[PDB]
């Protein structure tokens, strides 16, 4: 059962320092606590912290995160979402 191991390499691509803080909003993120992170869950912790990513903003990232096209961020998927933007540069 393999589809994409990008979520795995993500944890390895980032330093332990990132992983630690990564679990910061990981709690406040999930609203229902039994699904994943969507465009709404993002603006939440992002708006109640400092960031201000509009609808189209978050939609732009999530669109790249979800490789299958579900619009939801899985566990490790939350790490690859940033990896697709970090190294991503020419």
């Amino acid at each position: 059962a393999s589809m994409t191991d990008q979520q795995a390499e993500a944890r390895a691509f980032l330093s332990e320092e990132m992983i630690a803080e990564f679990k910061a909003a990981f709690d406040m993120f999930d609203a229902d606590g039994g699904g994943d992170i969507s465009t709404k869950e993002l603006g939440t912790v992002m708006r109640m912290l400092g960031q201000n990513p509009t609808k189209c903003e978050l939609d732009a990232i999530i669109c790249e995160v979800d490789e299958d096209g579900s619009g939801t961020i899985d566990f490790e998927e939350f790490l690859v979402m940033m990896v697709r933007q970090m190294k991503e540069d020419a």
Binding site: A24, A25, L49, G50, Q85
Partner: peptide, 17 residues
């Protein structure tokens, strides 16, 4: 989107121990 350490560090893991 790139340097999201801000929001990530905002609440922080809150482990302490």
């Amino acid at each position: 989107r790139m340097s999201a350490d801000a929001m990530l560090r905002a609440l922080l893991g809150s482990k302490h121990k």
